[PDB]
Amino acid sequence: TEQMTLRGTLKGHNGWVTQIATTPQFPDMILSASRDKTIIMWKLTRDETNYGIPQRALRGHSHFVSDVVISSDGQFALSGSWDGTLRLWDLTTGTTTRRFVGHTKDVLSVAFSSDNRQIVSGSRDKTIKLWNTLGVCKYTVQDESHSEWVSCVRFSPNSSNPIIVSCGWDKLVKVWNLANCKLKTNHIGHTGYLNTVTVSPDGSLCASGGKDGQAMLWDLNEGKHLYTLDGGDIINALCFSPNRYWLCAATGPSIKIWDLEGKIIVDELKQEVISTSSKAEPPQCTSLAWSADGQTLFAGYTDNLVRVWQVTI
Amino acid sequence: WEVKEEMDFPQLMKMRYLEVSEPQDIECCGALEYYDKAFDRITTRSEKPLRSIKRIFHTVTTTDDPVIRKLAKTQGNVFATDAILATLMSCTRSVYSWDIVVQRVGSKLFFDKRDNSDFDLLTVSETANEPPQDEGNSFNSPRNLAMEATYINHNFSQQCLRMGKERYNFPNPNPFVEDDMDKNEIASVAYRYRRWKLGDDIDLIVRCEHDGVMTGANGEVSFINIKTLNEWDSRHCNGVDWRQKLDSQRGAVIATELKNNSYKLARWTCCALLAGSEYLKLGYVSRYHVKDSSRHVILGTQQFKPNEFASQINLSVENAWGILRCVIDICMKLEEGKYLILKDPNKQVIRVYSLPDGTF
């Protein structure tokens, strides 16, 4: 009875939707990063004609935007791109304030701290480098880093053992201790490149996924391995859920929602049938985001859309 | 049942009486409503779906209709409501059978609607090269494709104009044509009464249709009609894609629709001509994807003059009015008994049957 429905789309993009971000302060505004080199700040006018309308575009970078994240107060955004830079946007004006320029190659992912004091990024030059809110590269880890690219680097919103979780294309999940920027635990399980990594809201669990189509849950207190779930296709993004004990994943063109207590698929959200001729693959979901109330799932896609899945009861 | 008159399409091809003066007016009634240029200018690669609107049925025979019934017995002896002379004006184009009831009671010659194995609903692809199979209860079956087509010209008619805005009110109300209780869904559709000379007391009291009015670029009254086509399964009847060609090769789309639908286009053209309207609006409607009904999208609207377009359906109003006069001539020898004009479906020749004991 707790399945979802398709409540409407958010047109207005000219490329794949590589990342979507929300914030608990403003429940009427989401950010979507794309491959048309622009970020769109939406306004959720939940009406019949359109669920959302593009309120304001941000047009800084010169390549695809590959990540985006909103600060805690919901005022400053942080974006990373394939041109090798990071930008700290001020949402009210719509213009950038700081431009981080250390990274040589394409910046795959960006993250913020819980208190937004220090930020971290990851890139195709096989380095994970921290920064601060003023604009200077503080510390660039190089010892025992990933042998291939880094594709998702995230913090952990929890006071005890503040850590940096990361994953890359060498099939390894590394847990970094933030106080000394030293390696702490190395996870070796995955058998294909890792496209995403996520941390549970309650700061106890972590998830990881990629090419092998399987999602592995790793404990963050003792570095163990709880279990592993199997998705149909390439896991392009994972996203835990704040209110409910669920893990969502974007497997190929569908979205699988694994419960974490009975470990069954509660729902497998599929898009409707279009292009009835069986000559082309459907568009693949690329990103996932949960609203703070946990009643709405925003899903990026490959046909330049952003679909809105609403949970029912 | 008695057999009285039978004539083929060949005789209708060479029947003519060009005696049609500039028409007068008797009375105009019915509130009008304006349109939206943005809904008109919707074009290919900029789609918009087709919802459902509520059409208040207003098809009534002249005798039962109170406005006509308070004017038919007063003056005039030949009467025919709108979209009913098209039957006699599309004989050489049609291949199927229609049914209508001309009652020659006394000197009165008033047309009325009757049903005998055929209905008044829209007929699609009737006279095309390699006609559709229409077998069983398929998606392309005749009654269901016709029901889908009537669905579209009922909904899109009430979906192209700004219906929610304050409807302009003409001076005379339409009596009993959806007037008993104000359902508030009474459309812009107005009806005129006009009289023109054609022959031996053939001052024809004729109803008209105005499916809306469009405000001028400078601003004035300019009546319009809203009627639309439908696309389905382009491989059949030697079709062509509208979602790839409407923007730059719309002329070919009109050409192939004329080639496919000829009786239907003539049926519409008769109405758009006799109404004296300014613009004829043809909407272009197509399915969301092939082999899937109950879902449609409006791909555009084209404006052409109802007279110019009558010249482009290779239809002569002279021979049309003449075949009308000649079918009235063939219906002049008959008597007070009414006549159900049921054509022959398989082999297209016009026919009629005098009704025993007023058969209905």
């Binding site: - | 074009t43 670029a217 400078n218 730059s248 090769q249 719309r250 002329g251 070919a252 009109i254 050409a255 004329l258 084209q302 404006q303 052409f304 003059k305 007279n307 110019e308 010249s311 482009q312």
Partner: protein, 184 residues
């Protein structure tokens, strides 16, 4: 409400010939304020059927090599010819132009296979031929004569649109059909 040169409406023209409906571009999307635009219509095939018909008439008037490239001159002679047409006839000059295109186009030609077997004519090619015939009729009527090119263009396509044989384009069309009928 886009009016050609600011004063000629474009929604009451009527292309009465079904064949030339999608080649004489004059209404609803093809309305423009001027017969001048950076074209790029000779890039791909058939793209010049998406050009406004007055800009084709303007383009085909920059001819004989002393008037090559002089498009502003042809724009103003088209403007002046349209004003002369509206004075003489009493109807929209775009309608008169469209009727001159329809009447002046040849619909059966004769190609050299050998003796010249008759052939049918494409709609785009008969639009091309109609434009070229009207332009050269105007051009050769205004050469070494006190009349100006605006009056000659006006009287040329007025006589074309009405169908009389005193135009040059009607003479050439009749001659082409006469040979292509006597030599089927």
């Amino acid at each position: 409400d886009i009016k050609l040169f600011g004063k000629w409406s474009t929604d009451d023209v009527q292309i009465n010939d079904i064949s030339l409906q999608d080649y004489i571009a004059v209404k609803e999307k093809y309305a423009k304020y001027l017969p001048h635009s950076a074209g790029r219509y000779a890039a791909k095939r058939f793209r010049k059927a998406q050009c406004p018909i007055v800009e084709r008439l303007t383009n085909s008037m920059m001819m004989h090599g002393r008037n090559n490239g002089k498009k502003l001159m042809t724009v103003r002679i088209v403007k002046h010819a349209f004003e002369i047409i509206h004075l003489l006839t009493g109807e929209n000059p775009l309608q008169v132009l469209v009727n001159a295109i329809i009447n002046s186009g040849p619909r059966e030609d004769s190609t050299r296979i050998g003796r010249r077997q008759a052939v049918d004519v494409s709609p785009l090619r008969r639009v091309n031929q109609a434009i070229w015939l009207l332009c050269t009729g105007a051009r050769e009527a205004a050469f070494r004569n006190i009349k100006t090119i605006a009056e000659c263009l006006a009287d040329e396509l007025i006589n074309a649109a009405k169908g009389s044989s005193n135009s040059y384009a009607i003479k050439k069309k009749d001659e082409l059909e006469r040979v292509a009928k006597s030599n089927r």
